[PDB]
Scaffold this active site. Sequence first.
Site, PDB file in Angstrom:
ATOM      1  CD  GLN A  42      53.803  30.051  33.671  1.00 36.41           C
ATOM      2  OE1 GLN A  42      54.491  30.752  34.409  1.00 36.41           O
ATOM      3  NE2 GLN A  42      52.479  30.060  33.710  1.00 36.41           N
TER       4      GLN A  42
ATOM      5  NE  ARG B 101      63.658  35.118  28.651  1.00 37.28           N
ATOM      6  CZ  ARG B 101      64.257  36.161  28.093  1.00 37.28           C
ATOM      7  NH1 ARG B 101      63.591  37.265  27.802  1.00 37.28           N
ATOM      8  NH2 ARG B 101      65.556  36.092  27.817  1.00 37.28           N
TER       9      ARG B 101
ATOM     10  CE  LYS C 222      57.289  42.802  39.265  1.00 39.82           C
ATOM     11  NZ  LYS C 222      56.034  43.240  39.925  1.00 39.82           N
TER      12      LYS C 222
ATOM     13  CG  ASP D 210      65.200  44.328  25.576  1.00 41.60           C
ATOM     14  OD1 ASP D 210      65.221  45.553  25.332  1.00 41.60           O
ATOM     15  OD2 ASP D 210      65.189  43.458  24.681  1.00 41.60           O
TER      16      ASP D 210
ATOM     17  CE  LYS E 175      45.709  43.557  36.609  1.00 44.07           C
ATOM     18  NZ  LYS E 175      46.449  44.824  36.848  1.00 44.07           N
TER      19      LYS E 175
ATOM     20  CG  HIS F  41      65.228  55.847  47.118  1.00 42.74           C
ATOM     21  ND1 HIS F  41      64.620  56.778  47.931  1.00 42.74           N
ATOM     22  CD2 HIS F  41      65.951  55.047  47.937  1.00 42.74           C
ATOM     23  CE1 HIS F  41      64.956  56.548  49.187  1.00 42.74           C
ATOM     24  NE2 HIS F  41      65.763  55.506  49.219  1.00 42.74           N
TER      25      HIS F  41
ATOM     26  CB  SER G 254      58.294  46.644  38.900  1.00 45.67           C
ATOM     27  OG  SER G 254      58.333  45.608  37.938  1.00 45.67           O
TER      28      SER G 254
ATOM     29  CB  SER H 164      70.591  50.803  48.254  1.00 41.86           C
ATOM     30  OG  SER H 164      71.771  51.433  48.712  1.00 41.86           O
TER      31      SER H 164
ATOM     32  NE  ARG I 156      69.299  47.166  24.503  1.00 41.20           N
ATOM     33  CZ  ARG I 156      68.896  46.092  25.167  1.00 41.20           C
ATOM     34  NH1 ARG I 156      68.919  46.049  26.490  1.00 41.20           N
ATOM     35  NH2 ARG I 156      68.460  45.035  24.489  1.00 41.20           N
TER      36      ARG I 156
END
Lengths: 291, 292, 290, 291, 292, 291
Positions: free
Chosen positions: A32, A34, A38, A67, A74, A157, A186, A198, A261
């Site tokens: 946690q 960050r 995800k 980054d 998961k 897209h 994502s 968008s 990068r």
Amino acid sequence: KPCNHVLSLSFPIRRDDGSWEVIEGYRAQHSQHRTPCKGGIRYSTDVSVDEVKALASLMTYKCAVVDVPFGGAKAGVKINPKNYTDNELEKITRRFTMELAKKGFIGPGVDVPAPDMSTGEREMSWIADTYASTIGHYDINAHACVTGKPISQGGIHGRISATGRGVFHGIENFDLYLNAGGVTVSYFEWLKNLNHVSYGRLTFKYERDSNYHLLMSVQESLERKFGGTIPIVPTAEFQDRISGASEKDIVHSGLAYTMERSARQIMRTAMKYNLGLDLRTAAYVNAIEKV
Amino acid sequence: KPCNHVLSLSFPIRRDDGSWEVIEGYRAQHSQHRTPCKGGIRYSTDVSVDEVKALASLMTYKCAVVDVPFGGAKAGVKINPKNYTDNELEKITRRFTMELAKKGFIGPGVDVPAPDMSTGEREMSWIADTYASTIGHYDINAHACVTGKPISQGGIHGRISATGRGVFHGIENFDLYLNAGGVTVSYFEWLKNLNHVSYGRLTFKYERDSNYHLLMSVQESLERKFGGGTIPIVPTAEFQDRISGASEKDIVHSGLAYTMERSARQIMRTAMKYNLGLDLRTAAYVNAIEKV
Amino acid sequence: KPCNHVLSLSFPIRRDDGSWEVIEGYRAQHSQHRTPCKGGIRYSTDVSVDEVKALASLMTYKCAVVDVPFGGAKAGVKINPKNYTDNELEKITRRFTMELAKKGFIGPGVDVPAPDMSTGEREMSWIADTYASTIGHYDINAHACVTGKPISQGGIHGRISATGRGVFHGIENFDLYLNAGGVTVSYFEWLKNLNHVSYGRLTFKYERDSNYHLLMSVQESLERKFGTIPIVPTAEFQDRISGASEKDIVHSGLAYTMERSARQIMRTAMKYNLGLDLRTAAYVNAIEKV
Amino acid sequence: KPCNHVLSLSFPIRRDDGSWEVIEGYRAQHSQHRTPCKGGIRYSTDVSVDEVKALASLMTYKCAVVDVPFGGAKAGVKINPKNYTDNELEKITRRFTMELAKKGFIGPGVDVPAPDMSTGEREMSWIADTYASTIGHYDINAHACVTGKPISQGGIHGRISATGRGVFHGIENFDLYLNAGGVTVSYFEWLKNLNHVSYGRLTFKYERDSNYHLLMSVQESLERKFGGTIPIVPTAEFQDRISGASEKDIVHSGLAYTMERSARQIMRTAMKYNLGLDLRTAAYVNAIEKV
Amino acid sequence: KPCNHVLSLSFPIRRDDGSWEVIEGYRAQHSQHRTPCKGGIRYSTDVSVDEVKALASLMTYKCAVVDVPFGGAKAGVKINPKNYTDNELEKITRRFTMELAKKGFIGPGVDVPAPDMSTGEREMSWIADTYASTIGHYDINAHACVTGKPISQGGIHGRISATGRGVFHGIENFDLYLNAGGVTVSYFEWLKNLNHVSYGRLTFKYERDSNYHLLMSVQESLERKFGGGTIPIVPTAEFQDRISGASEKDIVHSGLAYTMERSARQIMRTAMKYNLGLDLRTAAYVNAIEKV
Amino acid sequence: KPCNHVLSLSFPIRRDDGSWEVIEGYRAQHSQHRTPCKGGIRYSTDVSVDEVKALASLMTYKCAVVDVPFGGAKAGVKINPKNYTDNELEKITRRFTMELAKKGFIGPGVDVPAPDMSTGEREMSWIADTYASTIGHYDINAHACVTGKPISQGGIHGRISATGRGVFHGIENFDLYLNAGGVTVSYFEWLKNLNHVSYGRLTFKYERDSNYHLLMSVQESLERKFGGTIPIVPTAEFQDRISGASEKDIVHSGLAYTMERSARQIMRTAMKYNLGLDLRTAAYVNAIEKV
């Protein structure tokens, strides 16, 4: 190093045949440091706590490499999707979403799931609908709770070809690094859902006009020097770029920039720590020192 | 004109030697016509209610001058920082943040603190951690509650220069105006924290490709008129450094320069309209009052 | 097809003479597949529930046509605005806002009202102030609850000419399509209020420097090849850079939306074999998008 | 049958010497048919997921037996309290509370923890203070996030006896049943915390006045019948009950009532299913059919 | 010892003639160890931060004396109420409530205001309506944000005579103790607002039936012991009036008497333990400090 | 006089045969002078918005008559329940609850529905479960959002005979007044759900001991007066009252108290305005001046 949160679930589903089934699922949140965390959801009968913990740790380090400001997570539901109908799968997905939302394991600022090989965009659509209907109803970012959604549901897209072109860009620059294109796209979808617009919607026509004005400036400046000259014609490829300017162009440019990068950072880390062709160790050192 | 929300705080801390100390603090919010409020925190023994109120009013007018949509605010803790260890300063900062958050005097949408001369980025990181952990835990903008953070904590690139670069730009165009540059950068940091992305992350490569295509177009249009010898493609050297070293710092600097130029133009127009010859302070104050 | 939600309100106001008046109002929300809903508020004595429902449906289809992610909504208050003072209208507007927000019919992520023929930016200022002061006080997006606001209250530059500019762009490309331009600009204002910054604030100077560097590169290359001066922009480009503002971005976005939706309508009309009936093509496009 | 939720935690603490240490913890919520969940926290080095799940199931059935509307829960922190000072034990307790409350495992209407053999009223005070300070400040019932608190912190009078008094009452009426006195007293403490007032505060003087008026009525009626008599005076023990009327009297009466009702229900169940002396089976059948 | 929160407010009102006025207000919260805080509001031109802080401390100790689980608080608005109309006073009260609510200085679990000599149940109704309409709209306990309300607005029966009854009971048992009946009855009103039901609503008839059954039992037992000859079933006169006129005020009076008696016993115990003479004020303060 | 809020809902349901159906409903909220509003739901094909508004007004005045602090409300769903199976009726009820709760028309402090002649306690169970699962999940009073629930779901004892017992009490004391027993018992159920405890749970044994001690006092006083005598044994009826002390006794006593008080107030109003046998006008005048 260890996963700080692990949730084990057991929820009932009402089968079409007329029986009750107990479904057990897992969700590991690694870091946690960050937020949000995800992570994907795997619909497989061979899922376990060890696998979700390991993949959450890997997700944390993968996000750190490119980054992306996400923690690792998961999920896994111990079912075989080929033994269930679409209605039963929808019920399972919606109840899993409900249970995760009640315990704070889902949310646009808490934990964002993503599709997997065993899942898809229909499951993400169901998850987003369930969250926005019941728990995230008063949240303006309710549809940012999940990624991998269809275009009509808030998807981005250029997501289908994200992993392959990320791999291509990583190879061109030269697992934790090469397989991170989908994570970046994502992240871009999450940003687009928070923006409620968008990419390029307010910019494309303005940039088109600016480019045409620059070309006209070159025209007139060359006409003033000597008295017919037409430096206003864009090249063919520039013309297709102008005509077909859309969100996928911005997504691809962002992916390429991120990969470049990260490749430069990994090269610098490999040089600093006197590593040779062992790029895996350099990437892991980079991710560890970033975290 | 007057400050509308002054909060006085008395909170206890435990000392390193095992003692108990009462710490006094003040937070002034001058105007809520613009939300959130914005202001720094001073760790000094000479802090007082009058000083924080005057500085909050100054912050309101300063933000109005440079078109930053923030209200004025100012905090002060009556301690001498050179008398406490880092652990005691940690505890003081975290408890001050806790009290301010409970009384609705800090938050991404109500009040954003900033560092000072006696305060740094470590205190800002402590404030952000405390807020995001306890009161603003279930808030997606929890780390937008404070500015002046380190880069790893959500800070903005180009914050160290900020004030000096703004002073330079203000002099170039020609207190309430010249010293506002840092405030502008803080605004940008706030926006960055609400964006959850760094500036130019999705734009740099696209713009670089578009510029290269424009140069391609000029080259191919000139090679059609006369004659491969013509190469209107290679960028100017400094343009090549700009392309290669494109980062958030460039966007922050450009935004700062744009804001300073706009504010200087507005101040000059106000000074002309009201017939003020060389007293630009009065013109700036009239401009800020008219905006507010 | 049918409206999902219709709310009827009866609320009291105290007139200047000291009397008590019961004011009738009603808000229709057609669809919630897109959140938030978006719609105008009409102050009139001839308003009816059927009118607001039909206008909410039309609003949904109009938003679908121009790819604006809003549901349809419409509000009506049964008063004659030329029969009340400014104080009375302020009281009516603020109490209507309070009642609508208590029942979940006003909010930045729920339902965004807009001005109308009988309402203006001063009604929207009252709505936004009432919402940000009472119900949406602890909400960072409290001022995104309404559009059509003045510039000082969080309004967008280019709002006045939005409908006419959209009509012009729609005619140039060649009701549901032509009259949608203002709606698009309202969308932009909403986005601006969610961004807490004006469009181009961090981009104008950077783009100017990039353009000047490109022209400088043209000079350098031409002078090295064969001095010549291809750095000066043309007069129109020069006052484009000098006058670069948010309204330029708003106009460009409006033109882009109009052009894209005109292409979509043309393609729909071709596929279903509709020669000159573009109303049917636009409605088919909107229905199949929803 | 299975536990609905199991949460595994890894959180860091700073030792007194100044060394970071990772602390493992678990919390199982068995059932959410009744809300909130209720359960104890054990500070022991032999805690495990299986033990906390089994004790959560046992807590569910125990609460069902004595008609206490709580689900079963159980927490365990894998530390030996004898190896830590009071300061770092406080840090461990507060951080455990922080994580559990962040992920929806502590709350007045979510999950109420209780002390154990390895914990006490000071740990409950720390938990309550941590929750009221950080996660719930706008909660008017944050005080009710935990039971087993001291009197000054919002504890209930009669908590110390509780288990022994319930054991005695259960024996007098004639594990799942005999050991449920503490659960009932913790339920009473939760109710007291929600009420924001102690039992009998607005009732004792009224009841005393009513009793004295009844005695006066008997006195006057007897004096009018034959022309004096002194029915006014209560007995000794009744006088001590009037003078010493406190909250623990009400708590004891409620505990006795609950034990008597549960014993009657268990006897009825044992008669219905023809169980001679296996009262454990009767109690489990009663709890299962209640749930 | 010190007040841990002091809030100074400056808010605008519009008068009937149209002129704008700036109104100054203060709210001091002394102790948050016991939530919610509890305190009155004074409408007077001689209000100041020092007086509100002293009265908040006094309220904390007074609540501690009578075992009322409230922290001390005190508010003051610097106006003379005899210079404003009822509409102006309504606007002032509602805006003061709004400002206090936005900063977390009024709420059923945060801080409960009460009337004073310059304030009444009308201002309490205004405060409750303002809070329940705007900030505490989605709160089930928005009624309990304030005490001293009218009966139709959620007030308690037996509030007007509360202070005098407490004074009488305190004298009967034998400032911090004698003048605490109003605090106890305001606590009872807060509890009644949380309960959403008046005291005795579900109990009066049950107790009446039980009392009539006990007397019937005595009558039948006496008739069996000897040869409807005896009538124990009839209650005495005063008991008959008590039964017929059973209401919430009886329960409130009994609770007040119980609280005063218990506090008197505790003060006597403290005065004996520390060997104090006829100075009960010191014993009461020592008792309150020990409890806090 | 007019209703403040009238909501009109049109929502889709999925039938068993595999067809989508649009269901129309509407809930009228008369006045918010006494939060929460209170009212029933009618599942009928003859429901109209005019009827629900009229019944909401009648509910407001009925609640005012019997001193129940609720505003009037009334909901109607335009379906014939005899044409639907239990599954699709459950789906209709759950979706109606969802739509009403999303826009502030269901809630423990907002608006409490009740059953009707065409709607029973299983619909109340569905409503309560839906509300407590989706929107009221983080609400400690989630199960107080609806009344008429089963006992296992938080219902009140004595709810089935409430209307008849109220009618009997009203007749004995001598529509807006006679038919208000169910409203009072629903108010008691709402209070019970708020309290999170049954009536008399902590009181029955204490009162029993007090009564026995009073009888002991009479016994001992009479033994000490004249030389034994047994004025301690309660009567038969008192003995069954002690043995069978339940929550329904308290509910019945509260209902009788409410009916008696309301009858007294109506008689006083009839005397004050010089009305004769027109008690309906007296009740309406009383309700109007109370509001």
